[PDB]
Each structure stands twice: as structure tokens, then as C-alpha cells.
Design a protein around this ligand. Structure first.
Ligand SMILES: [K+]
Ligand SMILES: [K+]
Ligand SMILES: [K+]
Ligand SMILES: [K+]
Ligand SMILES: [K+]
Ligand SMILES: [K+]
Ligand SMILES: [K+]
Ligand SMILES: [K+]
Ligand SMILES: [K+]
Ligand SMILES: [K+]
Ligand SMILES: [K+]
Ligand SMILES: [K+]
Ligand SMILES: [K+]
Ligand SMILES: [K+]
Ligand SMILES: [K+]
Ligand SMILES: [K+]
Ligand SMILES: [K+]
Ligand SMILES: [K+]
Ligand SMILES: [K+]
Ligand SMILES: [K+]
Ligand SMILES: [K+]
Ligand SMILES: [K+]
Ligand SMILES: [K+]
Ligand SMILES: [K+]
Ligand SMILES: [K+]
Ligand SMILES: [K+]
Ligand SMILES: [K+]
Ligand SMILES: [Mg+2]
Ligand SMILES: [Mg+2]
Ligand SMILES: [Mg+2]
Ligand SMILES: [Mg+2]
Ligand SMILES: [Mg+2]
Ligand SMILES: [Mg+2]
Ligand SMILES: [Mg+2]
Ligand SMILES: [Mg+2]
Ligand SMILES: [Mg+2]
Ligand SMILES: [Mg+2]
Ligand SMILES: [Mg+2]
Ligand SMILES: [Mg+2]
Ligand SMILES: [Mg+2]
Ligand SMILES: [Mg+2]
Ligand SMILES: [Mg+2]
Ligand SMILES: [Zn+2]
Lengths: 114, 245, 53, 68, 91
RNA sequence: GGACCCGAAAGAUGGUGAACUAUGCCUGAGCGGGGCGAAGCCAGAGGAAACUCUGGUGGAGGCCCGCAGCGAUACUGACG
RNA sequence: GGUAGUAGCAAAUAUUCAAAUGAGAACUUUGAAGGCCGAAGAGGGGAAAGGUUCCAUGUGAACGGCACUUGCACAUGGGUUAGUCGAUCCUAAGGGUCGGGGGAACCCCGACAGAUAGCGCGUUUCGCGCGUACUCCGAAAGGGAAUCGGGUUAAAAUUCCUGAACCGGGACGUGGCGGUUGACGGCAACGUUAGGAAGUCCGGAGACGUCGGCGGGGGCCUCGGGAAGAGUUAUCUUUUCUGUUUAACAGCCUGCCCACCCUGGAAACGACUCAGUCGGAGGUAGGGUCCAGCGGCUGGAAGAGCACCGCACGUCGCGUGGUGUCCGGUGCGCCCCCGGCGGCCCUUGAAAAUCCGGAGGACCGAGUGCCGUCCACGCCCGGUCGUACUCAUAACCGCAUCAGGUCUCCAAGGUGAACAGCCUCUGGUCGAUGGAACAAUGUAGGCAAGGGAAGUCGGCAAAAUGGAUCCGUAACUUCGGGAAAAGGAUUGGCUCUGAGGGCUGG
RNA sequence: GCCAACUCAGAACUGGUACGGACAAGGGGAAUCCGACUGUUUAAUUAAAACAAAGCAUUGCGAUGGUCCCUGCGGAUGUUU
């Protein structure tokens, strides 16, 4: 039953001082630092996760470190809005513009009548 | 011969307000041409809890009148408002709960909240949970509107002062008994260092006029002068009467 | 390394499985501390629901 | 370290300038050919000793080769 | 089985604070923890998030209401008064 | 006038400490194993109905025994 | 000076035998035995604090409250190696300031009385466009770019050696990719190593309380089989003990619990959790997408490490060779991480640096070369300071080598509900000046016939009770309690019996 | 057919009635006084009936304001109503 010690001069069990126990080829246990759990991108409209993007730390998303396909979604507002949110936005825009046209036409017709 | 607690309050440094987790001041939009003449539309995006404040607050997003950007505001929530609702602020805004209107456009008998005192001050009256002001009458000659405040006082303000239609949300909070000291501790922890309170008669004479004596008692009338100096002005200040009604 | 054998522990485990040393005079915790009724209920619910499925 | 699954790709990798050395490990069940490049060590596993020998013969003359 | 004759939810307080105060707080305890009808999606899924804030788990709409109830009594009266005044102005 | 020598409790002036302790604020960390069994939920029984009852599930509490931690009641024990 | 060679040396269970050295050994070293710490340690590291106490050699005097051959003492030398661990960067509570306002002045308030710092585009270095009065200090536990095995010293290492990776920055070359100027595929969720773009605008991550259940992963604990070595063997024991390993990183696969997409349209309602809950706002069902991983395989990598068995020099080869490192089970188990629900709040539980994505499309290129290119490979560089050691019953504070005080990480087996008490393994240790005797009086710990509070101010102290299972439990009550009320019975060992599950096969 | 765990409940036999065999671990009951309760306090003679507490009541105040700090200038309550 080998007992371990911290590998760094951090002696407190904070969120940024998380470790895992790993067995080395030398037949002994050792600590290894593990990054804090991070939530991936979230859709502001629905509040649910954005599909197709892994949950990494902010610096792990850097272009030099992560492939473009892993941080991009091939759709309008891809990576920012969910598919349902984008569909809702498109439908709302189209219908609101149509209603604006209808209102303008109705106003013109009323003006012509009077 | 020692400074009393009430006196020490003014210096602060332990009696300052606890505002670390607050979400910023709640106020109307700055009065501008759009609100003065027509109306401007915003959308309620969130209803949030402001620590130390009973009333919930509403985040409202507006389109900037003359800049390509979003105008973000934090209003004191009126009861009945929801996320995704459209809020209309201006002189021509419709008389619906949640809309901000100039008092000149609000008919008599209307219930409003966060009423401005000076035109453009962005709201100072009737902001607490469950509170509201009532529009009494208008005077077009001097352009002044009369309102009844939550305390029952009648105040005259310029008719250009704005007010949100409806009452403040969160009413009835004070009805619930707290039942224990821990609830009060939690309540005042986010407000200020004003709890618990030690009675003056429990202190020694050196630090309170009520202190001292072989029995616990004030020893002189608890009513004090309005002009009594700090350190002597304790108890019932300038009381016109005392006791039960 | 100094000898510390597990033979006695294994023999005691065998005897306990046979049913020895399990009387009322060998129990210190309550029935609940020994085996929660919640654990028993969870086991029964899982078994019966799996059978029904 | 990276693994090359094709002898043609292994030869392409060994033909480039930055290929420093080649190490041939003789395991019981296969033969491993390791090319040391600037960035990565490329390992090719050959299950058959005949193709392993053919590869060893086909190694470029100018590349150092060592046996383990 | 009828676990408590009359205490109900306030049984968590044991024998503290007095019977009158326990009975008084029972109303708030029940109301603030009950579910409420959602007018936007027609479901009984409205729950209190914090004092005055009521969110629906199904459709996600959040409303500002009473401290311990979704709708205070005075809210309906205020709505009726505002509607009457708006109708008078519009007519 | 130092006024034969030594001696006050005090008074004044100008500076130094919150590494102890008191309180507010910011940012971290820590707290076995058991007992009681509130809301909510499932099933069954009685009854003409109203409704009542029973057995389970669940895990609330400035709740209880209690380890660490924190504290310090008695021996008016030891030491003194 | 007398006191006086007197008061004292007494907590933390404990020492003994042989040998070596030495003038001198109860106290130094080796071996053997007998004990203790007993994993919320007397073990192994850190933060503050100390500052050489760290390591080697030697030692007159002093000191180590007896002693010493000895040493945290003394003397002479040696020792702390970083692009990856920190500071450094960001901002928190707050601190310090310009201007302004006060002030005899030392100074006071602190972005509040005001022509802000500057920031982008193209360039004849000038023009154009944006520009809300602090671009300052403040965390070796908050946020945060990047390293892993193996080996090595008397004393250093994620810093040294070897091997293998990663991060940031710079510049080009080769190949590839697009031009329907700005890719392709999928009905879709979305997938593929590439696959335009400037002012302007928008979103997300960073980014967050506490408690309870359940589930997943890693390490540990535990059972069985194969093989290697060791222990016991008057008797039995296919038995007892030890070890039977796989790092960062790259590729492929897999796809928890959720979330999402397509077909379809449901009461005889169904599905479903330990608990909940979900469904014409589209359930069950069928088929898919995505998300986590401390999951699997491969490369790293057996060449390494470990165990065992041999040959050789036998004073100095850090020499030379072989065998194995295998196959399964189990769980309200223990430590850590994660997922998803539920409870609580008149409490709702940071900011910024930084990074990613998106809306728009001014502007931009050619025909055998041009314009772009977050793609692959190749090339170069990476500062400054800290790094020894203790972290405490002698390395910090308490005038000391003081039974006090001082933040935190790791945590085996048995009994047992249990990081309760007791015993044990790894690791540490026998350090508390020693010897002889067993007076009074004391300190600490027990017992005591008959009586049972008569003692005493007073039941002070001590004694009695105590875990678990079964039966049973009054007055009063705020109906929640009282309650473990009270009052009774049982408990060992051995040999059995019954009940309570999983997987596979029509 | 192949595996799997410790829980529970019974029955014989048996020992000098011993058996939660060490360890671990409430004494109980009937009343009076005080304080509701949990919490806090005189570091080094007093832990309590003292302090706080939820509950109850009173007083001032609508910002050109109430209370308070400041030599002055200006500040705390106030990111408030
Ligand atoms: K993607
Ligand atoms: K004074
Ligand atoms: K206080
Ligand atoms: K008080
Ligand atoms: K008095
Ligand atoms: K009194
Ligand atoms: K004289
Ligand atoms: K301090
Ligand atoms: K703290
Ligand atoms: K000697
Ligand atoms: K001045
Ligand atoms: K300033
Ligand atoms: K830091
Ligand atoms: K290395
Ligand atoms: K934080
Ligand atoms: K929660
Ligand atoms: K790594
Ligand atoms: K773009
Ligand atoms: K070091
Ligand atoms: K230290
Ligand atoms: K007596
Ligand atoms: K007496
Ligand atoms: K308590
Ligand atoms: K108490
Ligand atoms: K006490
Ligand atoms: K009191
Ligand atoms: K004021
Ligand atoms: Mg009194
Ligand atoms: Mg248990
Ligand atoms: Mg301090
Ligand atoms: Mg107790
Ligand atoms: Mg521990
Ligand atoms: Mg030394
Ligand atoms: Mg100045
Ligand atoms: Mg800066
Ligand atoms: Mg709880
Ligand atoms: Mg085990
Ligand atoms: Mg080997
Ligand atoms: Mg675009
Ligand atoms: Mg000193
Ligand atoms: Mg057990
Ligand atoms: Mg003044
Ligand atoms: Zn809804």
C-alpha cells in the first residue's frame, strides 16, 4: 500500500490541484495532474450544449492546438445557436417580414379607399 | 465616555453595505428623444434575484436609437412580467403592466412603480417588493401630477416623470415568520452588519445613556430632542407620542 | 517482510459463510447498520423489474 | 511516436532528408522498423520475416541501420 | 399510513417555535413548494427558483410573481384596474 | 530655582502596534458511524357514501447518540 | 556566604545478549532477541517561519541540565542546474494616484469640479475612421500556455543523463487544397486533415453554494487458477509469505448518464427511477447524431523496471548471459474524479486576463499561370529570480533541545456499525541520566465481609446502567414529542435447515 | 447448465449458566425555580437565571430627507427608496 505525496509545492486540495493515481512501468504509483472539468459551448436560447464540439478548457480550443472541424459546426450560427433555435429564428424572420409586407399593403389599400 | 454604536455607524468600514454579489443598480433607461416623443421596444431576457433585495430584477435588451449595438438595461421587475415579453418605454407606450410611461400619459387611479422624482432621475419611488404608487390627479396648468406613495404620503412631481405600470413583484415576503436567528443572520449577511442588536440597557454607562444601574432600566424618558447631539440622541427620537394607538 | 498471514481471516470467512459466529451475541451494529433495508429494497426492485421486462 | 501501416509509406518516410537513423527490433512474432525523424519516431510492424528481410535490403544506402 | 395527524409539512420543525407560528408558516411552506399552472404551455410545471421568481420546467418561461405564490391577490386587481383604464383611454 | 538625596496615583505633547485578540469584507480549505423518520409517491383493506385505516417507498430538521475538529462542566484531582 | 552536596533527575509501556572500535562504552556502530508508534502514526511530503541547521572528514576546550568514542556543537571542504514546477500574467476585498476640492503645513478626499490613454486601415509617414479621465499595486491555496517514463549523487532533480513529447514565437521552402473567386458529404442531428476576407456587431467558455440517493471511471482492498523464489515440516498443510509492471504523447475503436435528429401517430393509456418523472408542444417502438472517459487496441515498449537461475574478475570489467512478467472472479467496501436527478434559502452562493465561435461582406484572380490557403512535412529561438534542509515531544513561536501553540495532502489487514477502543503489516523507533531496596507520607490505578448516605453544606468521588434482538412503555403535550420512558427476556461453540440472485441456451 | 454474496429466520447437539466473556458502552423516577428552544459570553477564579434570538410593540424619515462620520473639503446607510 504505497502512500503518495504532491509532486508540486501546492499543499492544499483546491479545484486546480486535482490529480489521478497512475501506475508507472517502474512498478510504483504516482500522481499526475488532471485539468478541471469544463462545460462545453452552450446555446443561449435553449440553454443546452452545442453538439459536435468537445468540452475542453478555453486554451485547449486554440487554433494551433485543435482542428477546425472539432471547433466548427457547418451551419448558420454553427457553434453558437442550436439547430432548433436557428430554425425558429429563420421562421420568425420570414413570417415577420411577410406580416410587415401585409401591413404595408393594407395601409396602402386603406389610404386608396379613403 | 465612549463613542456609542449609532455614532460609530457613520464612519463605516464595518458598517458598509455588502454589495459583492449584487448585479448593479436597477433603473430606467436614460431619458432620450425616443422616450420623450414616441416609444421604444425592448425584450425581457431574464428575471434574476438580486442579493439583499426582495424584489426580483429584469434584464431588458433594447435596440440603440442611433448606434449599431445592443442597449442593455436592468429594471425592477413588476409582477406579471416574463422572459420574452415586449416592454414599451415612452410617452406613446400603451398602458400595460411592465411598460414605462410618462406620468402625463397615465390616467388617474393607475398603479405604478419605480416612479421618478425628478424628470430623468430614472426612478426612486416605490421600488420594494409588493409596493406601488397610485396616480391621484393631474394639473396641466403647472404640468404636475399628484401621487400616493407606499407610506401613504401625497407628493407632487413634474408630469414628465416616468413610472412603470403595475406593482413590484415579490409581494407578501414579510408575512412569513422567520422562526429562528439563523434566518435573520442569512438575511442581514447580504445586507450589512446590523444584526444582532444589543439593547442599550444591557450595556455599561460608558457606552450608552441607557447603560448602568443595579436594575435594567433606562432611568429617564426614552424620548429625546430632535436637536440632541450625536451620542445623546437615542431611543424614540422626536416622538410626538408613544405607546399603543 | 515480517509474516502477516491471512489464513485465519480466510478460515473465519469460510465459517461465517457456513453460518458460524452470526448469533445475537456477535452483533454490535443495528440491523440497519449491518444491511440497510434501502439496499434490500433496491435489490428487490431491480430484480422484479428486470424479470417483468 | 506514430505507427505506419504500409511499407510504401515507411519507405517514403525513410527516403526524406530528416530521417536520421533506422532501428530494427526482432521480436518473437514480428519485426519492428523504427525511423527517427525530426518530429516523430515512425514504427512499422511486419509480421513476416521474409518481407522484413526484403525491407531491410530495400533500405536506402545512405541511412544508418542498427539491429536489436 | 397517516404519518401525522395535522402537522403535515411543518413536522420538520419538531416541537420548536410554537404551534401558532408553525401553523402560520405552514401556508407559505405549502404554497412556495407547490407546482403551479403555466399559462404559456398549459402544464403544471411552474416552480419557484427564488423569492418572486417562478420558472416553468417544460417551456422554460420565467415569470415575476409573489414571494411565496405565483400570483398575489393584488395582482389580479391591478390587472383589472389597468385594463379598465386602458379601455377608457382607447374608446 | 532640581534646591539636602530617593520616591506617587496622575496631567500634557508627539509618535508605534489588529504577527494575539474583537468585528466587517475577499479568496481557499475541513467536518466517521448510527437513531428518530416531515413533505412527496406506490399498493391494499373497511364503508351505502362521506371518508377512514393499513403496509411500503423517500429522507426534512439552526433534531438526537457520537469520531475528528471546536470548546472547557466537575474533581474546587495533579502541579502550584 | 549559610541554605547544600540539600530540593530535586519520576508523564509519553523496555530493554537484553554477543561482537567491533576506543585510554575510557548502560548511552557510538553491526547482528540477534523482546517491545512500542498502529495509516485523523512516533510513517512519507508541502505552506508559513527559520537560514546552512543539508552532505563528507576530523575534533583540544565549551555546549548537548548523567555520560559519550558522540553531534541539529566545533573546524575544514562540498552541495540548490527548469521554455514545460512556481513567481512572473489577470483581476477580488482593498491599496496607491493625476486633475479638481480642502489644508499654515506635514498632509486629507480619491477618476468625485477634466482638451484620457490611445486603438485599427492604407501610406508621398501622411491621411482616414473609431476613441465614457488611472493601460498603476493587490492571490508561491482564486483564474491560468506547454513533459513524461527509465536512470543517476555523500548531499540536486517533472531542473542533471538517455529516450520520447508538448507549448509560445519567427521565417521561409516543398507538397496538398479552392477558384462555379472562396471545398465536399448527410433528409437531419451532423461529418471530413485544408476549404476568402476589413471597420462594425453578437454569443459562449473562463464561471463558481450546500446536502441526499443512484450510476460510471482510475487507484487500493479482496478471492481463485498457472509459474518463480522464500517460510514451516516431531505431526498436518497442492498450504503460508513476496512479487507477477506499462508514463506523457499519436492514431484507430468504443460510445456511460444525458442532449439532439428521422419514420410514425398513442385510452384497454403507456414508458419508467431507489426516489422521481416523461408523452399529440409527438410517448412506446425502429433507426441514427453528438457528448465524457482517469474506457479498449496499437505505437511509445521491452530494448525499460522487477523476480528468479547461471558464468566470470575474485585487489579497480557501473561485467556477461538465459527464464517469466500469465488467466479469471467479486463488492451498500475505502480514496479521488465524473455524470444525472432530488431537497434548502426573506441566504441564490466573484471579476478579469485569455480563448473559441458566429452576423455582415467593403475589398480581392488568373489560364497555364495568378490570387488565397486555420492543411501535411521541413528550419531557428525561447530571458530573469526561487529550487539544499527542518516543518517540529530538539531546525518555526513560547528567554531553552519547554508534555503548551502553529494551515494542509496520502492512509493497509483483523475484530467491530465505525478514519471508536485493542492487536498486526510497510515505514519509524526503544529518545526520555542509570543502579539497589520496596519504610512512613504522597501521586495514579484496584479490591474489600455485614450494613447501604448513618458520612458530608451538598451523594463530592466512586459504584451501578451501558452493544444488539424480541416484548412492552404512563402523566403531560404546542399532537411534532415525552421515548432508549418505565418494565421484562435473550446473547457462546458446534452440526444443520429454509429464504433472499446473475449469465447462457428455444 | 455455469457462476455468485452476506444478510435474515429457524432446529438439534454441547460446555462448571459461560457467552455485547477484553474492548467498546444511558443509571432511572416524582416534583419546584429560572430561561422558550439551537446559539453566545468574563483568553488566566464566575458558562449562568447573564447576552443574543425568532415573535411583539413603539419612534423618525418621501432625498431641498432620517441617522451618523468629518478641521475642512466631502463622506457611510446607498449597486438603497
Ligand atoms: K464539429
Ligand atoms: K469619547
Ligand atoms: K454583527
Ligand atoms: K437584543
Ligand atoms: K440605566
Ligand atoms: K427594564
Ligand atoms: K536651597
Ligand atoms: K494574522
Ligand atoms: K474564510
Ligand atoms: K576514541
Ligand atoms: K489645493
Ligand atoms: K482621484
Ligand atoms: K496564482
Ligand atoms: K526524462
Ligand atoms: K472562483
Ligand atoms: K442543487
Ligand atoms: K501531460
Ligand atoms: K466571418
Ligand atoms: K530542488
Ligand atoms: K515549509
Ligand atoms: K447523605
Ligand atoms: K445541612
Ligand atoms: K446544537
Ligand atoms: K443553549
Ligand atoms: K454552559
Ligand atoms: K437575553
Ligand atoms: K443622507
Ligand atoms: Mg428586564
Ligand atoms: Mg454500515
Ligand atoms: Mg488578523
Ligand atoms: Mg450529549
Ligand atoms: Mg484522513
Ligand atoms: Mg548532519
Ligand atoms: Mg493635485
Ligand atoms: Mg495590466
Ligand atoms: Mg441535511
Ligand atoms: Mg477488503
Ligand atoms: Mg527484460
Ligand atoms: Mg461569413
Ligand atoms: Mg524573541
Ligand atoms: Mg464487519
Ligand atoms: Mg463640512
Ligand atoms: Zn410552461
Amino acid at each position: 500500500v504505497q502512500r503518495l505525496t504532491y509532486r508540486k509545492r501546492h499543499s492544499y486540495a483546491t479545484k486546480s490541484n486535482q490529480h489521478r493515481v497512475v501506475k508507472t512501468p517502474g512498478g510504483k504509483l504516482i500522481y499526475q495532474s488532471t485539468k478541471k472539468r469544463a462545460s462545453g459551448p452552450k446555446c443561449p436560447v435553449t440553454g443546452k450544449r452545442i453538439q459536435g464540439i468537445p468540452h475542453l478548457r478555453p486554451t485547449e480550443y486554440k487554433r494551433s492546438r485543435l482542428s477546425r472541424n472539432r471547433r466548427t459546426v457547418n451551419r448558420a450560427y454553427g457553434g453558437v445557436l442550436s439547430g432548433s433555435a436557428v430554425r425558429e429564428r429563420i421562421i420568425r424572420a420570414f413570417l415577420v417580414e411577410e406580416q410587415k409586407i401585409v401591413k404595408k399593403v393594407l395601409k396602402i389599400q386603406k389610404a386608396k379607399e379613403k | 465616555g465612549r463613542v456609542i454604536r449609532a455614532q460609530r455607524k457613520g464612519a463605516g468600514s464595518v458598517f458598509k453595505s455588502h454589495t459583492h454579489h449584487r448585479k448593479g443598480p436597477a433603473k430606467f433607461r436614460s431619458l432620450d428623444y425616443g422616450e420623450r416623443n414616441g416609444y421604444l421596444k425592448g425584450v425581457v431576457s431574464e428575471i434574476i434575484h438580486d442579493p439583499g433585495r426582495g424584489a426580483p430584477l429584469a434584464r431588458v435588451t433594447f435596440r440603440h436609437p442611433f448606434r449599431y449595438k445592443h442597449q442593455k438595461e436592468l429594471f425592477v421587475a413588476a409582477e406579471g412580467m416574463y422572459t420574452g415579453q415586449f416592454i414599451y418605454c415612452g410617452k406613446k407606450a400603451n398602458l400595460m403592466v411592465g411598460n414605462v410611461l410618462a406620468l402625463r400619459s397615465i390616467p388617474e387611479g393607475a398603479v405604478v412603480c419605480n416612479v421618478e422624482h425628478k424628470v430623468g432621475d430614472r426612478g426612486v419611488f416605490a421600488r420594494c417588493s409588493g409596493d406601488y404608487a397610485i396616480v391621484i390627479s393631474h394639473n396641466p396648468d403647472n404640468g404636475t401630477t399628484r401621487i400616493k406613495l407606499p407610506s401613504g404620503a401625497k407628493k407632487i412631481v413634474p408630469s414628465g416623470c416616468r413610472a412603470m405600470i403595475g406593482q413590484v413583484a415579490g409581494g407578501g415576503r414579510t408575512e412569513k415568520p422567520m422562526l429562528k436567528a439563523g434566518n435573520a443572520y442569512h438575511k442581514y449577511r447580504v445586507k450589512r452588519n446590523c444584526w444582532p442588536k444589543v439593547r442599550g440597557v444591557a450595556m455599561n454607562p460608558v457606552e450608552h445613556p441607557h447603560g448602568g444601574g443595579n436594575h435594567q432600566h433606562i432611568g429617564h424618558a426614552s424620548t429625546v430632542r430632535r436637536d440632541a447631539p450625536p451620542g445623546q440622541k437615542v431611543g424614540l427620537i422626536a416622538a410626538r407620542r408613544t405607546g399603543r394607538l | 517482510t515480517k509474516i502477516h498471514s491471512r489464513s485465519r481471516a480466510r478460515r473465519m470467512k469460510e465459517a461465517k459463510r457456513k453460518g458460524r459466529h452470526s448469533g445475537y451475541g456477535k452483533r454490535k451494529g443495528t440491523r440497519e447498520a449491518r444491511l440497510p433495508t434501502k439496499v434490500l429494497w433496491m435489490r428487490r426492485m431491480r430484480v422484479l423489474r428486470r424479470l417483468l421486462r | 511516436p506514430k505507427q505506419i501501416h504500409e511499407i510504401k509509406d515507411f519507405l517514403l518516410t525513410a527516403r526524406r532528408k530528416d530521417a536520421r537513423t533506422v532501428k530494427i527490433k526482432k521480436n518473437k512474432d514480428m519485426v519492428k522498423f523504427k525511423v527517427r525523424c525530426s518530429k516523430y519516431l515512425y514504427t512499422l510492424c511486419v509480421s513476416d520475416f521474409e518481407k522484413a528481410d526484403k525491407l531491410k535490403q530495400s533500405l536506402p544506402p545512405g541511412l544508418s541501420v542498427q539491429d536489436l | 399510513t397517516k404519518r401525522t395527524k395535522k402537522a403535515g409539512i411543518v413536522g420538520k420543525y419538531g416541537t420548536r417555535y410554537g404551534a401558532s407560528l408553525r401553523k402560520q408558516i405552514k401556508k407559505m411552506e405549502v404554497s412556495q413548494h407547490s407546482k403551479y399552472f403555466c399559462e404559456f404551455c398549459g402544464k403544471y410545471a411552474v416552480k419557484r427558483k427564488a423569492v418572486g421568481i417562478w420558472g416553468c420546467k417544460d417551456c422554460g418561461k420565467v415569470k415575476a410573481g409573489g414571494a411565496y405564490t405565483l400570483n398575489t391577490a393584488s395582482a389580479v386587481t391591478v390587472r383589472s384596474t389597468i385594463r379598465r383604464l386602458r379601455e377608457q383611454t382607447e374608446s
